[PDB]
Design a protein around this ligand. Structure first.
Ligand SMILES: [Zn+2]
Lengths: 31, 126, 198, 173, 58, 50, 96
């Protein structure tokens, strides 16, 4: 697998789609 | 059709950085693209670009960057969230930058921590 | 103005390239530019000849090295064409008779001054791109600053070992070089001396 | 770029003149290390120019007790006056190669036209004096009266006894 | 395969090139002085700083 | 073609990002310097490449 | 060897010397995971973290897709153990 790919959402081309749960999951981790 | 002309531009930049070309022809121009490349040029990942008119952008690139990307839903982010967002988007905290559309403009996360302002995550490069 | 180079032989003559696909000269004694020629493609780097004061070489995005005369910019004195991607750096040997070019693909190309085609090509899977190549002042070893973060030390004359040689050793080497200068154009000798693994 | 080099040994001090000097970029190369090993490929580098032996063991003792402390002796100044071309460093210099840095500074202060390179700082002259110390028995053998082993033995004993003051409080035999 | 397929670059005539080689280089066929003078290289590089030329020689 | 072995070595550990400029000393013989892409420069001595 | 009491190495006391292989290095860059910080958080002790030139050689021999992991390895604050052998095979280098 590619190393450079980030861990939050799926990547298609240059567009990175983040589901609404994942941005909530980061806000849960901060709190 | 991808209305995200920023994503079409960044797809062209990623194709050139993979294919080893030394310039592109970003055919639909904008102003958010120009600000994005202004940040990339501040951090030295792109040599020199010009906006010519019919317009389009000619972007001399150094061969230093790895990946460009846009965050498509453009989530809002505070500073205490910004640290975790940086360390979850970048492979390392000292490599690459996250782009923010703040109330002070469009800038990187280090300039956002300098100027003490939060905002929406729009894109990233490394 | 991308590159700048003092002429080391003739002092107070400065050459420069610019992204107008142009080369410009400068006389430092009367502080003004001198002449400007527009080429077809952009030139990455200018350099001068350390033994002949008037000859210069531009490494250019036409995959090409142009050896020019600074007195008559009408035509190129020589055109070295061997590359695949753009030429990033060119450097004359301190004896003034050879050239190194590091290219934007993964190659170093060693040239004679009157050749017009590659004497040698150097490459490596670990070498990622090539940005700056320059001789040592021995004119025997070349150095390569890459995009992998590595400065590598290669040698020109890849099959010629250094150090002190005995007389019957360096006579055998000089005899082989003179014999290849004579019979180097015959078919078997030609194909074996031109074969290099790219 | 070295022109001459000093080399001090127990029988005396000799200065060699280098011709076909050593490659400085390929000093860590195996072919150049093999050249520094073999006498048939290092005697092409060095050619013996001058030799000054001691007159006596007292002069050799004074020679060590000046050179190790750093100060150059008057007869070393004499032989350098005789062998080096008389210049002052305004338009042409002579590069000498010496083993010690304090001796380098003093030879440069005594002769302004001679630029000295110390073996403690410069790797070229370090490898070159290392090769001469390697082959020092054969480079001198045409004028080496006897050997060097007993000379080094007696001179090390004389130097150690002068440093220790051994005979004035060793009496039990 | 031992014949030559075309004329080399400086030469202009078959008689010129095929009569210009004409003499073996080796030590079996020529004297020692001739062998040394005929296999001396054109550029003789000694060790040291090869600095660019200060003043015109001629 | 058999004894064509051109690679000799590599100066030190290298840089972190790529080497985007380098320059020799035209007076000396073993003084090199190289400046990388993360803006760190290094001065190398060619006699001790470790 | 001394300091070996029946498969219990008494030579390893903190600061721990940790040799890094290319597989571990590629996967610790892939898992968004900081190398020295996670090693210190695993061992609860100060590590010094070394990379052999065979490991750097295999990371360089892999293409420019792994340039980020290469830069992460080429961080300056870590010890570089130069190897004196031929093949640049990281497994046999580490085992020897
Ligand atoms: Zn190893």
């Amino acid at each position: 697998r590619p190393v450079d790919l980030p861990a939050v959402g799926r990547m298609r081309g240059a567009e990175l789609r983040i589901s609404a749960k994942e941005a909530a999951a980061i806000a849960r981790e901060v709190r | 059709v991808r209305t995200s002309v920023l994503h079409d531009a960044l797809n062209s930049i990623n194709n050139a950085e993979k294919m080893g070309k030394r310039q592109v022809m970003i055919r639909p121009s904008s102003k958010v693209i120009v600000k994005f490349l202004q940040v990339m040029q501040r951090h030295g990942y792109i040599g020199e670009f010009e906006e010519v008119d019919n317009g389009k952008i000619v972007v001399q690139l150094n061969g230093r960057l790895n990946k460009c990307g846009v965050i498509s839903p453009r989530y809002n982010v505070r500073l205490a969230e910004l640290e975790k967002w940086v360390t979850k988007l970048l492979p390392a905290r000292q490599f690459g930058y996250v782009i923010l559309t703040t109330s002070a403009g469009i800038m990187d996360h280090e300039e956002a921590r300098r100027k003490h302002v939060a905002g929406k995550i729009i894109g990233f490069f490394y | 103005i991308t590159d700048v180079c003092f002429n080391q032989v003739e002092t107070s003559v400065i050459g420069s390239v610019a992204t107008d696909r142009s080369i410009i000269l400068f006389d430092l004694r009367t502080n003004m530019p001198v002449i400007k020629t527009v080429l077809h493609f952009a030139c990455n780097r200018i350099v001068f000849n350390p033994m002949e004061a008037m000859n210069l070489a531009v490494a250019s995005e036409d995959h090409n090295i142009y050896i020019f005369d600074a007195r008559n910019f009408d035509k190129a004195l020589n055109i070295q064409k061997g590359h695949v991607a753009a030429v990033m750096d060119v450097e004359f040997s301190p004896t003034g008779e050879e050239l190194v070019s590091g290219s934007y693909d993964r190659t170093i190309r060693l040239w004679r001054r009157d050749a017009g085609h590659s004497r040698d090509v150097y490459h490596t899977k670990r070498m990622q791109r090539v940005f700056r190549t320059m001789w040592t002042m021995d004119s025997k070893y070349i150095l390569t600053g890459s995009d992998d973060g590595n400065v590598r030390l290669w040698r020109a004359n890849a099959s010629e070992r250094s150090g002190v040689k005995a007389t019957r050793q360096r006579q055998a080497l000089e005899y082989n070089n003179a014999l290849l200068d004579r019979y180097g154009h015959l078919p078997e000798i030609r194909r074996i001396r031109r074969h290099r693994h790219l | 770029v070295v022109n001459f080099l000093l080399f001090e040994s127990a029988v005396g001090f000799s200065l060699f003149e280098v011709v076909h000097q050593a490659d400085t970029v390929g000093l860590e190369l195996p072919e150049v290390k093999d050249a520094m090993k073999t006498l048939d490929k290092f005697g092409k580098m060095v050619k013996l120019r001058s030799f000054n032996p001691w007159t006596s063991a007292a002069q050799g003792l004074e020679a060590i007790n000046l050179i190790s402390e750093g100060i150059m002796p008057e007869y070393l100044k004499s032989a350098l006056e005789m062998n080096l071309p008389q210049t002052s460093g305004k338009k042409s210099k002579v590069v000498l190669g010496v083993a010690d840095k304090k001796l380098a500074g003093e030879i440069t202060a005594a002769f302004p036209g001679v630029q000295c390179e110390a073996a403690d700082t410069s790797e070229v002259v370090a490898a070159l004096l290392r090769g001469i110390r390697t082959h020092a028995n054969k480079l001198h053998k045409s004028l080496q009266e006897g050997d060097i082993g007993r000379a080094q033995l007696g001179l090390g004993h004389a130097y150690s006894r002068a440093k220790v003051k051994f005979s004035v409080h060793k009496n039990d035999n | 395969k031992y014949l030559a397929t075309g004329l080399p670059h400086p030469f202009e005539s078959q008689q010129q090139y095929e009569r210009s080689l004409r003499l073996p280089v080796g030590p079996e066929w020529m004297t020692k002085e001739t062998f040394q003078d005929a296999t001396k290289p054109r550029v003789i590089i000694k060790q040291g700083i090869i600095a660019p030329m200060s003043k015109p020689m001629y | 073609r058999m004894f064509a072995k051109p690679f000799l070595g590599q100066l030190g550990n290298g840089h972190v990002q790529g080497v985007y400029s380098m320059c020799k000393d035209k007076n000396s013989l073993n003084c090199i310097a190289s400046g990388s892409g993360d803006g760190v420069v290094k001065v190398w001595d060619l006699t001790t490449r470790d | 060897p001394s300091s070996m009491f029946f498969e219990h190495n008494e030579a390893l006391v903190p600061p721990y010397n940790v040799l890094v292989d290319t597989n571990f290095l590629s996967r610790t860059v892939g898992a968004k995971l900081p190398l020295l910080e996670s090693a210190m958080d695993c061992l609860y002790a100060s590590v010094n973290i070394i990379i052999t030139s065979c490991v750097m050689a295999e990371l360089e021999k892999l293409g420019p897709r792994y340039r980020v992991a290469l830069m992460i390895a080429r961080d300056e604050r870590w010890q570089r153990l130069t190897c004196d052998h031929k093949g640049t095979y990281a497994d046999d280098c580490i085992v020897d």
